[PDB]
Paper text:
The evolution of viral variants under the genetic pressure of LEN identified Q67H, N74D, and Q67H/N74D CA substitutions as the main resistance associated mutations (RAMs). High-resolution co-crystal structures of LEN in a complex with cross-linked CA hexamers revealed that the inhibitor binds in a hydrophobic pocket formed by two adjacent CA subunits.
To examine the structural basis for the resistance of CA(Q67) to LEN, cross-linked CA hexamers containing the Q67H substitution were crystallized in the absence and presence of LEN. The intended mutation at residue 67 was present in both the apo 2.15 Å CA(Q67H) hexamer and in the 2.46 Å CA(Q67H) hexamer + LEN structures. Based on the 2Fo-Fc density at 1 σ, the His67 side chain adopted two distinct conformations. We will refer to the His67 conformations that point inside and outside the inhibitor-binding pocket as the closed and open conformations, respectively. In the absence of the inhibitor, we observed only the closed conformation, whereas the CA(Q67H) hexamer + LEN complex contained both the closed and open conformations of the His67 side chain. However, the closed His67 conformation sterically hinders LEN binding.
Author numbering:
A (entry chain C), B (entry chain C), C (entry chain C), D (entry chain C), E (entry chain C), F (entry chain C): 1 to 176, 186 to 219
């Protein structure tokens, strides 16, 4: 990643074995559960495009998703080129060439070039631009691999309300509220929840159906 | 987090894989036991709002609690806006815009903005303000998920007093003393504890009923 | 903790996930065995009162002991107030208010205040004062939870002397020597140990009864 | 590796036990799966030729592949010598001798010499040149050890399309697309995929055959 | 420990959780095998007397050995006092009082005092003096707990010579050579070893009896 | 080890618990397999003679090999003394005494003396000299403990050629090529390998016999 030292300047640091192993392990254990995306974002803190490609390419398996990810990345890279066509001309001594979409995705740009953009004044945050592309594609994978629709999350006749709400928002998070939660509750709790009236908090709702 | 380097200035550091994994693991193992809250507070030492949201969002499951947490956060964010309405106007070069509740919760503010508030002179500690909101909501979850009331913690007729006191204050901690501990003791120990008289320490009480 | 950087000034550092997990694990595995106290003292090296409270509060369970600990802490805090009554008056710019017992215990003092005392010139070591209070209370727990008295540690008729001495000083350490070790030895070894005479070292004693 | 300190100069750092163990473990667990190559590249970030040889030589077993790797390395070293024949002459005080292929492979060059090239101005990146040689040879091993050809990856009559695409691109990655993926689909899905028409994305294709 | 920073001055660092756990674990696994002593010495690199006492006191169990260790430490502390009787007098501003044996053992000296001696110019290395006392006592424990004498290490009639030599020097190391190794070899190998003649290396000896 | 800080000067650092444990573990798991030697060399990066002796002495067991190692070390130390007889005389203020073989092996030299040689200008790299002695002796152990000769590595009549080549070069590495690999192949593959002709690469050979 590009990180500030203990003297105040942004320089490059090698991606750590702990970071590499942590990303691989969470994919092995959680696949594309929704909470994997913020883990990817945190573990790729300050990452260059090279670091982002490293993390994606160390994933063995799930290659259908990884190739969907590449298609989304190329879609965003082409949009970036439509909005930022580069102007031919010699690069001045204190400057960096404008990046193309494939430069931001780390496929046609060098590490020194990525360091140059990210540490520029003002910086061109090609790592953060690329990461937003990756997260966009990762979220589309989470939705597509989401097995259950929110319409099929219904409280059992003897299921504790807390467990039902857990499943409800787990499903809703992957699918990407308060009235549907009432409608899919069981007859006994739905009766209690209507007596509460509109505008009840989740805490009030869960308290009433305990 | 925002941490001081080894040269005396507050700068941003990436949240560590050890920190990320430690928060996830303690939630997996302890759910919302009371001792999880001080662990969350220590592991989020110096955290930005972005780091706090990272930690909450890496939690998979327990989504009923996580959504109750969001409702509490929004309640505190709205109160903050009622007490700190921002004044429209251009931000001077050496300054930071006042934050709104959603800025402190990290949803409408950038990392550079959070760094700017937290490292300001004087600093606006949006991380500590947000963390207090989160801990407020986490504590309400601990109470709601507390299974046993203190009234139902009674010493068994052959239960060692030490084990009973353990259960007593474990329950009391989650529910959020000395006379109730005597009343719920078994007949043999309660007889000993009355002979001790008022003002006995816990050590004296546990010594007498051994 | 408050630690010196690599440039010679005392500044605050966040308590590490390794430190937090190490304290929790040793309590889970060893409870209140005597050797847990020096582990607590080493892992709380340079700790602020906030760090000390963090470590105690991350302990789930053993709540009878943790509440005995609080009673001891309050006893020492009240003694400190009896010996150091603070003088009302405005705090000068380069100075820190005197701390009260509850300030040293980290309950009525801020982290900035604890940093201010500990890094003062001369420093007010509120962390070391608090830690001595905690260790005082922890040692009283070790004695109370010590199951066996030294009077009941007697060498078996076929028990190797080395194993008996192990149990002897394990028990003696928790209860908080040379002649009692001889008296509780078995007839065969006690006969050998009297022939050795007075002033024998433990090494000489264990050598003679092998 | 050669890394920048926290003061801005490139100096040598010892390869870490975490790095050494991480490379050994991934080879033990994954052998020469395709995703092992980017792991090797990341864990050898900033590596000298000495560090690269260290990592290769710590691999026990797979000695057929390791010897194929040496043959590829020697092939690239001989090509380098054909393109860069060194000119005999005394090395000036502020300078470094040109490297030969075996110097870049770390067999005829010292660590101080590798440090000198890599930290030169301009730098001769003998580590990155060597690493590209190693990765070239590693990729030829991945292809040769690839067990299944892409022609034999066909969707089962009841196999979910997602699982088939996973196997398809796992195989394709090791062998080193859209129309072959359709042709090898089962009759039911292939019928759906032709109705979609040309130019369908992978996401559209996987959505249609669900 | 007392360690040099990255700016060239000796300052105090807190003993690490990794160090604390590593010492505890090796004692749990290896007790007082001979190789435990160099592990203790390495893990106590740069340790203060306080750090050395921390490591010894975190050992639970083996209390017979730990008390023998204290007796040896007191013996060396008394010898030190016999050789270095301190001269009464006021300590000048830039100076440190001479240490007594109990000061070096960390029982009557503060951490600041130990830092003062160890970082003095010239330094009084109370940590290294104490460590030599500890290692002296630890080695006497290794010998006393050594179960087998070298006289009882004899090669079996079908035991491979390599395995016999392993046991031979394992035993000899704990007891604290070439002709005894020949005499205790089996008849077949002893016959071969006499034909070799005097002055044979261990490698020659093991080669001949294979 | 002796390492450069983040300010450009060579100073001493304590050998890490991770380094100590990594060396012990690899010996426990791999004994004296050939790949253990480069692991020892990497984990002893920048090591002093004291660090090298620490690593060797923390090895429990394999004492036949460790004593063969000492004999080799003494042989190299005596050769060093034959080539570098030291000249008696007072050491000037800015200088270091010449080292003897036992000084380089860390048995008659202090750590400060080893630091002085290794950080001298020009440096006397007693650590690297000693390490070469150790590796020399370690390699002789690998050969002696190598169980199988290369002459006995022959491909089975149904053994895959890849597996046979693996065993071939595993054995050859420990014993310390292309025509012997053909001669020991099975009749079917040897027939294919002769038709290939001379000068075939290992990749071509393994491809032809698949
Ligand atoms: Cl995976
Ligand atoms: Cl790849
Ligand atoms: Cl931009
Ligand atoms: Cl509930
Ligand atoms: Cl969870
Ligand atoms: Cl999220
Ligand atoms: Cl404020
Ligand atoms: Cl009790
Ligand atoms: Cl516990
Ligand atoms: Cl708490
Ligand atoms: Cl004070
Ligand atoms: Cl004994
Ligand atoms: Cl392997
Ligand atoms: Cl090798
Ligand atoms: Cl070049
Ligand atoms: Cl799908
Ligand atoms: Cl133990
Ligand atoms: Cl103790
Ligand atoms: Cl001295
Ligand atoms: Cl042998
Ligand atoms: Cl071993
Ligand atoms: Cl030793
Ligand atoms: Cl030399
Ligand atoms: Cl093959």
């Amino acid at each position: 990643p590009i990180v500030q030292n203990l003297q105040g300047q942004m320089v490059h640091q090698c991606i750590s074995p702990r970071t590499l192993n942590a990303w691989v392990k969470v994919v092995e254990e959680k696949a594309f559960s929704p909470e994997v995306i913020p883990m990817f974002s945190a573990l790729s803190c300050g990452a260059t495009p090279q670091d982002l490609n490293t993390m994606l390419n160390t994933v063995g398996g799930h290659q259908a998703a990884m190739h969907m990810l590449k298609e989304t990345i190329n879609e965003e890279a082409a949009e970036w080129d439509r909005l930022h066509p580069v102007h031919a001309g010699p690069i001045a001594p204190g400057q960096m060439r404008e990046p193309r979409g494939s430069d931001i995705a780390g496929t046609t740009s060098t590490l020194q070039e990525q360091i140059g953009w990210m540490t520029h004044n003002p910086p061109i945050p090609v790592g953060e631009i690329y990461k937003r592309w990756i997260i966009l594609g990762l979220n589309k994978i989470v939705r597509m691999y989401s097995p259950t629709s929110i319409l099929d999350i219904r409280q059992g006749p003897k299921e504790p309300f807390r467990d039902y709400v857990d499943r409800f928002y787990k499903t809703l998070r992957a699918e990407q509220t308060e009235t549907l939660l009432v409608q899919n509750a069981n007859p006994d709790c739905k009766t209690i929840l209507k007596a509460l009236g509109p505008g009840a908090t989740l805490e009030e709702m869960m308290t009433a159906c305990q």
